[PDB]
Amino acid sequence: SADYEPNSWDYDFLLSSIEVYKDKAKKLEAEVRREINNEKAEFLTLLELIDNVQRLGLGYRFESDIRRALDRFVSSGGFDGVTKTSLHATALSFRLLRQHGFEVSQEAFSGFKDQNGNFLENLKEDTKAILSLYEASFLALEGENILDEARVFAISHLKELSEEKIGKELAEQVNHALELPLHRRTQRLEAVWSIEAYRKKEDANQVLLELAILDYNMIQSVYQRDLRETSRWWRRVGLATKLHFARDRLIESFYWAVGVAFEPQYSDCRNSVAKMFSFVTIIDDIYDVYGTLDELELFTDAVERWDVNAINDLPDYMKLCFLALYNTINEIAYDNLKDKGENILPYLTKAWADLCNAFLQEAKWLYNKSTPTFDDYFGNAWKSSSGPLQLIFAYFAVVQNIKKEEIENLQKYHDIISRPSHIFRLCNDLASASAEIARGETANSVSCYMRTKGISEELATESVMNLIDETWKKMNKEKLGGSLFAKPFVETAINLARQSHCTYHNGTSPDELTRKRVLSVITEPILPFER
């Protein structure tokens, strides 16, 4: 059928003094759509265009155009011949195809090996192709050994590189890929970086470049508006000021939400997740350092009973904390009862009851100086991260028609939200591993892994790294098909993982990097286009 219905992100709506900005955005967008649709353009060129469009942060806007292009690139058999011509073309086309649900085999790289079954060592000459292969390897599924091998062959060459041999441009490109592959970096962060990079190319498509900048700043404006309303709500609750021991992480929480749902039409999800993580921060502090087991026991009990007529059992500080959570969640339940005509309160309260219990378990292991095996510890840790609770709330804010089966699967911690949480927990612990280890702390996935396997931090650190890689492959299959959930929500879940990779780094300085990123994504707009 024909679809003439409007999009929640069309400039005609998002840009309703400004009339000037709208017309230009639409004109630029029109020309870009024409290019992606160019029926007579060199295939490799078409693919490189799609790649920039996406890297610059505009893929969500030309989603159907790109699928259409990839479709005729396959039917015409342009892909079959490419897998025999260039490595760069194969890898790039492979990544874009798999990314868009297309069925591709790892055997498309078998033609770049030798009799020994190894990639031709001379391929390292074309650094560009090596970068492409690298990026594509990350979309590997379980079993695809060729891709795993390709990732190895790629990193070897990229590390042994230098600006002097490839140039300041390609060099900056290699360092970026290594820092974090495209498939794992959040879309908003990758866009800021690519836009700064593209605007320096002497042959960069000006129309596309202006559109990227204009669109990026437009979306950022929504975030600022979103954060403004949420900052008002937060300050209204005043929970952060009344609890002298608690730390305020509203801005950091919002930054985190942007990684989960960057599309402008997702303000609710963005706000729901920002608010939720904000409460998680305070409650986490309550169980981690402030509360005594007797009190923690009472609070946990209160969240399970979800009875407002029993807050007088809690000590003053928890009494305030509990009522704030109680109302906030009931608020969200109301919104859903009003919009979807469904009572989801049980699902939201269960998520919170579960989290608190995970927090309680850690408080107990800590108090009793217990030493659970990695499996028991981690099993509890990926839940205490709040990752699945955040996804359960995201669900109701992302899907229009909720399905009893889907929510029941989320309630059972289906792979869709558990896998990303595994990564969430692992990236957090990895970043603080060295610190907590040299301090005698054992409450950390890496530390726990060390004790459970009896190996060095270096050894354990690698094991955790490989653990993440495996999780990504299983996570990639979920999105590729055979999922109970709609692909849109599968991507949301995965974004939690992506955000995890970005908010947890080694270090520019660590605290310095977290400041720059939050500013480049929320506060400071991108410098206007220069002709």
**Is the domain of 512 the same as that of 372?**
yes
Structural domain contains residue 5: no
Sequence letter at residue 213: I
* Contact between 349 and 325 (Cβ < 8 Å): no
- The SS3 of residue 529 is coil
* Contact between 412 and 427 (Cβ < 8 Å): no
Structural domain contains residue 12: no
Q: What is the DSSP letter of 400?
A: S
Q: How far apart are the first and last CA of the chain?
A: 41
Structural domain contains residue 161: yes
The distance of Cα 229 from the centroid of its chain, to the nearest Å, equals 23
Rg (CA), the chain: 24
- The SS3 of residue 525 is coil
Q: How far is residue 390's CA from residue 392's CA, in Å, rounded to a whole number?
A: 6
**Is the domain of 194 the same as that of 230?**
no
The residue among 196, 218, 240 that closes a domain is: 218
Structural domain contains residue 9: no
Structural domain contains residue 10: no
**Is the domain of 93 the same as that of 47?**
yes
Q: How far is residue 362's CA from residue 286's CA, in Å, rounded to a whole number?
A: 12
Alpha helices in 243-368 (DSSP H): 250-260, 267-285, 293-305, 316-339, 345-367
* Contact between 161 and 171 (Cβ < 8 Å): yes
Alpha helices in 107-238 (DSSP H): 127-137, 145-159, 163-166, 168-179, 187-198, 206-237
What are the tokens at 468? 């993440």
Alpha carbons within 13 angstroms on the beta-carbon side of residue 362 total: 27
Q: What is the resolution of this structure in A?
A: 2.7
The residue among 176, 201, 218 that closes a domain is: 218
Q: How far is CA 216 from CA 33, 41, 223, 230, 439, in A?
A: 17, 27, 11, 21, 43
CATH number of the domain where residue 47 is located:
1.50.10.130
**Is the domain of 374 the same as that of 296?**
yes
Q: How far is residue 268's CA from residue 287's CA, in Å, rounded to a whole number?
A: 28
What are the tokens at 81? 């011949």
Structural domain contains residue 481: yes
What are the tokens at 393? 């709330």
* Contact between 494 and 394 (Cβ < 8 Å): no
Q: How far is residue 122's CA from residue 202's CA, in Å, rounded to a whole number?
A: 30
- The SS3 of residue 403 is coil
- The SS3 of residue 205 is coil
Q: How far is residue 73's CA from residue 84's CA, in Å, rounded to a whole number?
A: 15
Q: How far is residue 285's CA from residue 289's CA, in Å, rounded to a whole number?
A: 6
What are the tokens at 428? 């957090």
Sequence letter at residue 137: S
* Contact between 221 and 174 (Cβ < 8 Å): no
**Closest to 78 in 3D by CA, of 64, 65, 89, 91:** 89
Q: How far is residue 299's CA from residue 357's CA, in Å, rounded to a whole number?
A: 10
Q: How far is residue 173's CA from residue 252's CA, in Å, rounded to a whole number?
A: 27
**Is the domain of 436 the same as that of 491?**
yes
Q: Which residues contact 347 (CB under 8 A, 6 or more apart)?
A: 392, 396, 407, 410, 411
Q: What is the DSSP letter of 508?
A: -
Annotated binding site: 284, 288, 362, 425, 428, 432, 436
**Closest to 433 in 3D by CA, of 421, 416, 450:** 450
Sequence letter at residue 344: I
Residue 113 φ then ψ, to 5°: -115, 175
**Is the domain of 182 the same as that of 312?**
no
User: With 0-12 CB in 10 A as exposed, 13-18 as middle and 19+ as buried, what is 412?
Assistant: exposed
Residue with tokens 């495996």: 470
* Contact between 386 and 353 (Cβ < 8 Å): no
Q: What is the DSSP letter of 289?
A: I
**Closest to 56 in 3D by CA, of 245, 215, 195, 208:** 195
**Is the domain of 138 the same as that of 280?**
no
**Breaks in the chain follow which residues, C to N over 2.5 Å?**
16, 507
**Is the domain of 382 the same as that of 521?**
yes
Q: How far is residue 70's CA from residue 309's CA, in Å, rounded to a whole number?
A: 59
Q: Which residues contact 2 (CB under 8 A, 6 or more apart)?
A: none
Q: How far is residue 310's CA from residue 70's CA, in Å, rounded to a whole number?
A: 59
**Is the domain of 105 the same as that of 253?**
no
- In total, the chain counts a number of residues equal to 531
- DSSP state string for 338-387: HHTS---HHHHHHHHHHHHHHHHHHHHHHHTT----HHHHHHHHHHHTSH
Number of neighbours of residue 338 by Cβ within 10 angstroms: 9
The distance of Cα 248 from the centroid of its chain, to the nearest Å, equals 22
Strand partners, 113: 119
The distance of Cα 103 from the centroid of its chain, to the nearest Å, equals 23
The residue among 175, 195, 218 that closes a domain is: 218
Structural domain contains residue 4: no
Annotated binding site for dimethylallyl diphosphate: 284, 362, 425, 428
Q: How far is CA 439 from CA 260, 372, 432, 453, 462, in A?
A: 33, 19, 11, 20, 21
**Is the domain of 210 the same as that of 261?**
no
Domain of 319? 219-531
Q: How far is residue 509's CA from residue 511's CA, in Å, rounded to a whole number?
A: 6
* Contact between 410 and 439 (Cβ < 8 Å): no
Q: How far is residue 55's CA from residue 96's CA, in Å, rounded to a whole number?
A: 12
Query: What method was applied to determine this entry?
Result: X-ray
Q: How far is residue 342's CA from residue 310's CA, in Å, rounded to a whole number?
A: 26
CATH number of the domain where residue 380 is located:
1.10.600.10
- The SS3 of residue 319 is helix
Q: Which long-range contacts (CB under 8 A, 24 or more apart) does 225-234 make?
A: 226/254, 226/267, 226/270, 226/271, 226/274, 227/251, 227/254, 227/274, 227/522, 229/271, 230/254, 230/271, 230/274, 230/275, 233/275, 234/275, 234/278
**Is the domain of 183 the same as that of 263?**
no
The distance of Cα 512 from the centroid of its chain, to the nearest Å, equals 21
Structural domain contains residue 1: no
**Is the domain of 177 the same as that of 283?**
no
Number of domains, the chain: 2
Q: How far is residue 256's CA from residue 429's CA, in Å, rounded to a whole number?
A: 17
Q: Which residues contact 314 (CB under 8 A, 6 or more apart)?
A: 295, 298, 299, 302, 322
Sequence letter at residue 293: L
Annotated binding site for Mg(2+): 284, 288, 428, 432, 436
